[PDB]
């Protein structure tokens, strides 16, 4: 209950950091570990960076400043961006990353359960978004408790953008960062940060069919 927005080791074990080493390695996007080899993030993180050779993924990481050359990392094997996604648009901003080597689940690395197909209409009350967002990049992984807002109520503010049923609204948050909510005593990945007015998140529930098909 102490620490405020600062997170603790193993509190969000599914949180991963996506980084690229071009000249000076830096954190670009967050992601959700959904399996041994699978990471779920936002498609727009790869706009202009399609090559898989430069991406480094860190799991079980809390303090980004502690990352060193010796720190283990996962290399991308396949970047499955949603076919309907377009760089010029924010719709369908969901991407799947396949890691070259399966990760071992530990006290600091665990997958996040995905919502069931029927969970597209359920309402969540205890939701959190975690990331190393900006203010520079915060060293310690941050956590923020944000309430969810209905699509009808959200559209009143983002009048310039069409909020589809495949999106969630709420309102220290990374692009592609997880939006998790505790339901029935189990934490589920409800959304993916897409627009950082309220935050807008890709509704993972609507994309389960795509996720499972690509994953399997």
């Amino acid at each position: 209950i102490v620490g405020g927005t600062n997170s603790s080791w193993g509190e969000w074990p599914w949180q991963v950091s996506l980084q690229v080493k071009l000249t000076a390695q830096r954190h670009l996007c967050g992601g959700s570990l959904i399996g041994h080899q699978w990471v779920l993030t936002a498609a727009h993180c790869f706009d202009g960076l399609p090559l898989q050779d430069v991406w480094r993924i860190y799991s079980g990481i809390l303090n980004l400043s502690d990352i060193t050359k010796d720190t283990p990392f996962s290399q991308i094997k396949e970047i499955i961006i949603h076919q309907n996604y377009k760089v010029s648009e924010g719709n369908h901003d969901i991407a799947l990353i396949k890691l070259q080597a399966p990760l071992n689940y530990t006290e600091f690395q665990k997958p996040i359960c995905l919502p069931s197909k029927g969970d597209t209409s359920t309402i969540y009350t205890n939701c959190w978004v975690t990331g190393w967002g900006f203010s520079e990049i915060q060293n310690i992984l941050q956590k923020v408790n944000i309430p969810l807002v209905t699509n009808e109520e959200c559209q009143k503010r983002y009048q310039d953008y069409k909020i589809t049923q495949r999106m969630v609204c709420a309102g220290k948050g990374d692009s592609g960062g997880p939006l998790v909510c505790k339901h029935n005593g189990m934490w589920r990945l409800v959304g993916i940060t897409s627009w950082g007015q309220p935050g807008v998140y890709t509704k993972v529930a609507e994309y389960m069919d795509w996720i499972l098909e690509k994953t399997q």
Partner: antibody
Framework: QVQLVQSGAEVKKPGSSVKVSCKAS????????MNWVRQAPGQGLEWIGQ????????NYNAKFQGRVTITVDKSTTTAYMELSSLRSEDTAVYFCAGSLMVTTGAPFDYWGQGTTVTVSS | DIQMTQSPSSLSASVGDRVTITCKAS??????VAWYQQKPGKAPKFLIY???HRGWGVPDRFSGSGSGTDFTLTISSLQPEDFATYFCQQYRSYPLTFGQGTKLEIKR
């Protein structure tokens, strides 16, 4: 700031029940597990149970199951522990402790000042 | 229930000394062990979690180590404020359990 303030000391007789309250402030009361721990004068620390106020989910130590009921009042952000069928051995200082993590009940990063409960005829 | 045995029950040391408290779990608790500091009449204070990581604002002199069934708390340079009872807790499995406590006393 983050505070956990418990009720005052209680003196009870055997066979009665005591209700210890823990008023929390300064954080997301509904998102953290509230744990109840008692420290008997000669048996160290003993975890009683925990409640997640958001869903009212509870876990009780099998020792106390059937006698402890942990409940919360979201409106006032207050957690309660109700220990029934009190015995003289229940004399102890009862603490409420907030979990370090939103996602799990242990460990406890902050404790209340404790409530002395004395059970005696 | 997983029993947690701390050693020694009491320990005398001086300001500036390096002191080590050990906690032994009767079962494998991995690294799911936390350490608490309690002074007389006050509430326990959170020091270590996951057996090595310090809590919020805990001085760097407090060091935790160990895994499996054997765990250790080390204070590199005892300050007069460090003299108190120390408890180890395991949260690998429920019910959560604490050690009997190790009291640090001023050597005279």
């Amino acid at each position: 700031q983050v505070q956990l303030v418990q009720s005052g000391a209680e003196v009870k007789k055997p066979g009665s029940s005591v209700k210890v309250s823990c008023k929390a402030s300064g954080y997301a009361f509904s998102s953290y597990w509230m744990n109840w721990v008692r420290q008997a004068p000669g048996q160290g620390l003993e975890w009683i149970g925990q409640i997640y106020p958001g869903d009212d989910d509870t876990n009780y130590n099998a020792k106390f199951q059937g006698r402890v009921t942990i409940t919360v009042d979201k409106s006032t952000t207050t957690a309660y522990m109700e220990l029934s069928s009190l015995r003289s051995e229940d004399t102890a200082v009862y603490f409420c402790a907030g979990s370090l993590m939103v996602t799990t009940g242990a460990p406890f990063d902050y404790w209340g000042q404790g409530t002395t409960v004395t059970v005696s005829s | 229930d997983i029993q947690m045995t701390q050693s020694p029950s009491s320990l005398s040391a001086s300001v500036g000394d390096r002191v080590t408290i050990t906690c032994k779990a009767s079962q494998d608790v991995g690294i799911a062990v936390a350490w608490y500091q309690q002074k007389p009449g006050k509430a326990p204070k959170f020091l270590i979690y996951y057996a090595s990581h310090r809590g919020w604002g805990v001085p760097d002199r407090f060091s935790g180590s160990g895994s499996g069934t054997d765990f250790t708390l080390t204070i590199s340079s005892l300050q007069p404020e460090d003299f108190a009872t120390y408890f180890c807790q395991q949260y690998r499995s429920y019910p959560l359990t604490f050690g009997q406590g190790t009291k640090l006393e001023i050597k005279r």
